[PDB]
Amino acid sequence: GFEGGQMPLYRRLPKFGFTSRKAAITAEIRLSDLAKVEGGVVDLNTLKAANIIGIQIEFAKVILAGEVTTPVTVRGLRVTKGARAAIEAAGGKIEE
Amino acid sequence: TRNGRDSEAKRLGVKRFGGESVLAGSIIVRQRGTKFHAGANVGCGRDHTLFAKADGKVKFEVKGPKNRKFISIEAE
Amino acid sequence: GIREKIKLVSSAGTGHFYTTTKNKRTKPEKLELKKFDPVVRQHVIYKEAKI
Amino acid sequence: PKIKTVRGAAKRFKKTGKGGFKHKHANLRHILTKKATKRKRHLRPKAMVSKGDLGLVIACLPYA
RNA sequence: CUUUUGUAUAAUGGGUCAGCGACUUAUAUUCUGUAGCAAGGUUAACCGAAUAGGGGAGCCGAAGGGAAACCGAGUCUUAA
RNA sequence: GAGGACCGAACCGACUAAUGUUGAAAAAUUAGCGGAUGACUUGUGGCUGGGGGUGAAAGGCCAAUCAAACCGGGAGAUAG
RNA sequence: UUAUUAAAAACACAGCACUGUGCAAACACGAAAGUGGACGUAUACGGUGUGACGCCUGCCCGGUGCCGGAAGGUUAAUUG
RNA sequence: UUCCUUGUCGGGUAAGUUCCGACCUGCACGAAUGGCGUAAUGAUGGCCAGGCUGUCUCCACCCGAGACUCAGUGAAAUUGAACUCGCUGUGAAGAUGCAGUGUACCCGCGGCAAGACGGAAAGACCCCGUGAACCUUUACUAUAGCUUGACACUGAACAUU
RNA sequence: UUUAAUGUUUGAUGUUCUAACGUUGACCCGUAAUCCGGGUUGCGGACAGUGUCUGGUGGGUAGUUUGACUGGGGCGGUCUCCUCCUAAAGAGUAACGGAGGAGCACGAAGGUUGGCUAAUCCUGGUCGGACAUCAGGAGGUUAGUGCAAUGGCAUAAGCCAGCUUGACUGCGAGCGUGACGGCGCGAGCAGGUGCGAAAGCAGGUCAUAGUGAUCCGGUGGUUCUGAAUGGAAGGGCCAUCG
Ligand SMILES: CC[C@H]1OC(=O)[C@H](C)[C@@H](O[C@H]2C[C@@](C)(OC)[C@@H](O)[C@H](C)O2)[C@H](C)[C@@H](O[C@@H]2O[C@H](C)C[C@H](N(C)C)[C@H]2O)[C@](C)(O)C[C@@H](C)[C@@H]2N[C@@H](COCCOC)O[C@H]([C@H]2C)[C@]1(C)O
């Protein structure tokens, strides 16, 4: 970063933002990961057992990424409106 | 007393010459006064920058009873 | 270097304000203008206050 | 030993999707009454690091 | 030979010979080549008549946007 | 028979000149020179130690070493 | 007196002056104990400047320092 | 101590930027960081005179120790390599080495120092380095020491209020 | 209504006192000892002295700083910005080259609608003059522009009046200019507003100088965050200040 004495780029620009401690305990789950789970019903514990999310994850969200083919019961997870349609299209069920 | 001062050059002058095709908003000429005047489809900025208000080819003309130079956009 | 910086506070409840300069020696009277308040999205009157 | 991040750079640059870096604009901390609103408005959104400066940023943020 | 705009230079260095004498190592990181596997890839410590096998704790990747909550193939900006 | 008295050897010193300057000698020799009962000189032993000593003071001297000794260590200090 | 290019008009000096110091002295060396000053006691001791002797040593207390003053202003920890 | 300056005048000399005496126009003396005198003293500074002389005019001879030759022993600095001339020109701008030209048989010995930008010591001058050291101060920041107060070690009685 | 004086808390001091403490006073013992300790006594005495805290002083000592450009260095001058020339008819272009300026001003000197057109001189005319105001002619911008220069300006960008706050908020096609940080121009869109009958014009000022990154911190706001949870502190975001 030394530029010969001129105020370097990372010092003449302002600092911004802050780091959220909740983002470190939140994960995203692809539709293609719903088949890797064991038992069909997916929750925090079953996703951790399947080594899909970290052990310290407290909040998990399923997004429209990949593709789901089997009926899956999502429980206690936030689901995007795009993934909600794809899960219900494969005979799945979403319950809060 | 002592000289040795000057200011930075301002890069004035014509940016798009006659016949050039320009997009809407393209700066045509930067100038201090209105050495060139706005014609058809050409605006005059607050610093008398002439910019194209429509696409087409720029055109220089001398018109009026004072023989003033005008810049217009032949919309094409 | 005489003009002091002032702020014009909106008469509406919102804390929105503009900032401008003023020569308080020649113009001791408070400045009042109708300016757009982006919080209520209306043109209300703005009164002077200290920066 | 691991490379150490320049922590000052980590607080000013965020890595974007295609590998670029976004950053906040300068000239928007203090005296602002004299600045035109149009000028201040164009400084609010984040900007991308120019091509000439990517070498400096990448060297300072090896784990970004 | 070096150093220089420029050296037969009266600029530097060497009396000669023989031996020795200067871009290495470790760990990270990025890129290129090459090999394996491939939406996956790979294990670390450790266990182990141990270069095998076990060990998937982890790490990287398959999703991003936003300061963030959050939303999510979109998201942020804004009353829009 | 007084004297930091006089002349002048030993003794202590070092003013001038020459020589020497890879010397006889990392400070001398030769010829002259100053003090020579005193704030004199000398032997033996002791004490003061490094930002410290000692200095009738020249930054002098402190083992051929001094505007901060020597030896070992930090140490392969750093050297645009 | 500059050991080893300077011996001098430099340093010292007797004398002079100022100033500090009442003795567990000032002061100095010491984290301290203590020691020197001194087994001394203001006709003494320390510091500073001047430098035998002779004739002398004028004006300025605004600045800086030192000494004295204590009314007032300002002002630390503390207190809350 | 005086820049102007070899000030001016006087003395000394045939001739004196020094010296001595005076003048005052003290660039920029001055009274204990002392002023002005001062006998004696000084390997102290300046100047003059007598004596004396190879200091000199201007060197000559002589006596010794080297130098020189023979025998014995036997160094040193330095050194890119050398078959290592003059001149004029040229050229990193002062040439043994380039150009042109002149001169010159091969090799010693005794001498002399004009050149080899001769030898010696990575210029002490000068500049530079966001080098060093030590020194100074009303540079900055600290700090030993000195000093102020509060609290503690630290109590009683009583006035004064 | 008021006044005095005995009783109390805290101070404000002082004159006594002795019992802490001091004693480098005397005497005794350890002890055949000018150390030290104990004892007796005297004299001081809550002072002195020491610890923690604190103000002052502090080249006694220590660590350091003490710029660059530069026809060598120093001295002098200069260091950012604007205008002209050098600059070779696009842009750009150096010198301790030649000349000048800026570190602001203005709620009108901004917006809009309506109107208006100078300098100078001549002639005539109370005080009145070379120069005041009046009238006419000439003249044609030689004037004016908040300020340097340059380029502009009559449709005036110059001058006057009315009404006003667009010196708006969110944005922004597309360009210009920079190594970059940046800087500049901008039609149009949304919201709301001013002037005008209306077409329209207005996102400051004829244009180009009037300026300072980041950090740290302040103030206001904020359907952001809140280290068990609910809050809060702090942080973020927006506006703004040093
Ligand atoms: C007695 C012999 C010593 O040399 C001398 O004394 C010389 C006279 C000495 O010079 C004297 C006398 C002087 C006048 O130069 C003639 C004076 O300028 C110089 C600085 O000092 C040499 C030339 C003197 O050399 C001159 O140095 C100056 C600085 C530059 C001269 N020249 C390059 C122009 C150069 O000739 C040196 C530096 O003294 C020589 C040096 C190589 C050696 N060191 C010196 C040590 O003593 C002197 C102290 O030094 C710190 O001793 C030298 C060398 C070994 C000798 C040769 O031993």
XYZ file of C-alpha atoms (C1' of nucleotides) in Angstrom, chain I:
242
model
C -41.626 40.981 66.191
C -36.254 40.454 67.621
C -31.815 39.860 71.263
C -28.410 37.544 74.513
C -26.139 33.403 76.661
C -25.070 28.494 78.756
C -25.555 22.983 75.797
C -23.866 20.359 69.908
C -21.825 18.815 64.308
C -18.505 20.169 61.102
C -14.911 23.036 60.130
C -11.352 27.981 60.874
C -6.873 28.704 63.312
C -3.645 29.366 67.971
C -1.804 28.471 73.530
C -1.202 24.466 76.642
C -0.269 18.830 77.279
C 2.315 13.901 76.421
C 1.660 9.161 74.975
C 3.020 8.265 68.985
C 7.372 9.928 66.556
C 12.563 12.394 66.454
C 17.170 12.899 69.212
C 24.250 12.920 65.037
C 22.255 15.230 74.535
C 23.757 12.619 79.109
C 24.147 8.010 81.806
C 23.693 2.423 82.303
C 23.969 -2.683 80.075
C 24.898 -6.229 76.250
C 30.675 -5.319 76.111
C 37.696 -5.752 77.333
C 33.176 -1.908 71.258
C 32.718 6.459 69.470
C 28.717 0.364 65.250
C 24.120 -1.342 66.832
C 20.275 -2.650 70.340
C 17.948 -2.313 75.095
C 17.204 0.674 79.555
C 17.101 5.474 82.468
C 16.700 10.596 81.651
C 16.620 15.282 79.379
C 15.035 18.126 75.192
C 11.824 18.468 71.156
C 6.650 16.824 69.992
C 1.843 15.733 67.043
C 5.774 19.474 64.527
C 9.588 17.226 61.948
C 10.207 13.171 58.766
C 8.652 9.088 55.300
C 4.600 6.726 51.776
C 0.600 7.634 48.080
C -1.608 11.594 45.425
C -0.926 16.595 43.558
C 0.562 21.918 41.547
C 5.175 24.539 40.593
C 10.199 24.500 39.247
C 13.612 21.491 36.669
C 19.282 21.481 29.866
C 20.756 18.558 36.312
C 19.745 14.342 32.897
C 17.440 11.767 28.663
C 15.011 10.768 23.911
C 14.386 13.444 19.630
C 12.937 17.159 15.925
C 14.986 21.308 13.369
C 11.292 20.678 5.131
C 11.971 20.900 -0.111
C 12.894 23.593 -4.582
C 17.698 25.881 -5.865
C 22.343 26.827 -12.794
C 26.858 23.963 -5.785
C 25.054 25.104 -0.717
C 23.727 29.195 2.361
C 21.031 34.003 2.304
C 16.737 35.927 -0.431
C 12.458 34.168 -2.898
C 9.009 30.296 -3.618
C 5.342 25.993 -2.173
C -2.387 25.672 -3.092
C -5.882 28.025 -6.544
C -7.524 31.596 -10.957
C -6.398 34.612 -15.878
C -3.148 35.934 -20.044
C 1.562 35.103 -22.819
C 5.656 31.783 -23.692
C 2.586 27.180 -26.341
C 4.916 26.116 -32.553
C -3.940 27.852 -35.693
C -7.164 20.444 -31.608
C -5.686 18.982 -26.301
C -1.376 19.194 -23.369
C 3.538 21.286 -22.738
C 9.235 23.487 -18.885
C 12.495 27.336 -16.503
C 14.456 31.170 -9.707
C 10.525 32.836 -17.917
C 7.037 37.704 -18.822
C 2.507 40.062 -16.382
C -1.704 40.046 -12.754
C -5.211 38.020 -9.039
C -7.824 34.638 -5.133
C -8.293 32.329 0.616
C -14.630 36.193 -0.780
C -19.271 38.651 -1.484
C -24.947 38.468 -2.088
C -32.087 36.489 0.756
C -30.671 39.887 -3.296
C -26.280 41.161 -6.200
C -30.913 34.524 -6.597
C -35.912 33.023 -9.697
C -39.502 34.869 -12.983
C -42.591 38.420 -15.671
C -42.798 43.324 -17.721
C -39.872 47.307 -19.299
C -35.280 49.810 -20.469
C -30.252 50.948 -23.416
C -24.588 53.275 -22.631
C -19.279 56.175 -22.677
C -17.752 60.673 -24.066
C -18.505 65.331 -26.234
C -21.082 69.704 -28.216
C -25.073 73.646 -27.678
C -28.494 76.237 -24.462
C -29.721 77.058 -19.483
C -30.542 80.356 -11.603
C -26.989 80.010 -7.927
C -23.451 76.222 -10.741
C -17.608 76.576 -11.245
C -13.235 72.012 -16.018
C -16.809 68.580 -13.557
C -23.751 68.196 -10.112
C -29.199 68.376 -11.997
C -32.265 70.111 -17.070
C -32.968 70.200 -22.544
C -31.306 69.074 -27.471
C -27.865 67.177 -31.079
C -23.615 64.260 -32.133
C -21.859 59.440 -31.043
C -22.860 53.969 -31.343
C -20.979 50.462 -26.405
C -15.131 53.627 -26.885
C -20.088 51.946 -21.342
C -21.540 48.510 -17.970
C -20.571 43.317 -15.497
C -19.929 42.735 -6.741
C -13.525 41.643 -7.760
C -7.816 40.009 -11.694
C -7.361 38.765 -16.713
C -9.428 36.399 -20.784
C -13.550 34.805 -23.473
C -18.398 36.571 -23.698
C -22.880 39.741 -23.451
C -28.410 43.961 -27.455
C -32.927 38.228 -27.631
C -28.728 41.775 -23.793
C -25.400 38.058 -19.363
C -25.920 45.559 -18.700
C -30.163 48.903 -16.071
C -35.383 49.327 -13.471
C -39.864 47.636 -11.290
C -43.697 43.782 -9.677
C -44.362 39.082 -7.497
C -41.410 35.664 -5.190
C -37.656 31.310 -2.728
C -35.839 26.306 -7.913
C -29.720 29.100 -3.347
C -36.077 22.505 -4.175
C -35.782 16.606 -2.458
C -34.915 11.914 -4.904
C -32.606 10.569 -9.474
C -30.165 10.680 -13.999
C -29.484 8.829 -20.476
C -24.965 10.525 -22.061
C -20.435 12.919 -22.108
C -15.841 16.025 -20.521
C -11.235 15.860 -17.542
C -7.881 13.400 -14.401
C -2.388 7.786 -12.751
C -5.719 7.820 -8.866
C -8.379 10.273 -4.920
C -11.477 13.216 -7.672
C -13.581 17.473 -10.495
C -17.010 19.221 -14.245
C -21.495 19.457 -17.817
C -26.142 17.372 -18.300
C -31.412 16.594 -21.298
C -35.036 13.815 -19.116
C -38.097 11.157 -14.879
C -40.763 11.361 -9.878
C -42.436 14.477 -5.819
C -43.527 19.307 -4.402
C -43.087 24.843 -5.580
C -42.443 30.067 -7.767
C -43.277 33.533 -11.736
C -46.197 34.058 -16.416
C -52.551 34.821 -19.886
C -49.759 31.108 -22.119
C -45.703 28.750 -24.792
C -42.370 28.338 -20.978
C -38.372 29.423 -17.345
C -36.117 28.252 -12.488
C -31.742 22.227 -9.172
C -28.171 29.848 -7.261
C -25.142 34.224 -9.348
C -21.999 35.910 -17.673
C -18.230 31.914 -17.215
C -13.548 30.459 -15.344
C -10.374 31.623 -8.390
C -13.019 32.173 -3.084
C -10.132 25.997 -0.978
C -8.371 20.867 2.729
C -8.405 13.920 2.042
C -8.574 10.478 6.132
C -8.620 9.655 11.305
C -10.722 11.311 15.960
C -14.671 13.863 18.102
C -19.410 17.034 18.549
C -24.862 18.081 17.470
C -29.823 16.550 15.336
C -32.490 12.619 13.184
C -33.100 7.411 12.402
C -39.924 1.045 10.716
C -30.492 -0.578 11.557
C -27.535 -3.070 15.466
C -28.092 -4.106 20.968
C -22.361 -9.976 23.489
C -28.159 -14.699 28.416
C -33.175 -11.930 27.748
C -35.941 -6.789 27.951
C -33.801 -2.101 27.768
C -29.679 1.009 27.714
C -24.512 2.267 26.494
C -21.764 2.051 22.229
C -21.743 1.377 16.939
C -24.017 2.058 11.948
C -26.908 4.991 8.460
C -28.689 10.249 7.131
C -27.944 15.570 7.931
C -24.234 18.748 9.781
C -19.943 20.992 12.799
C -14.375 21.379 14.397
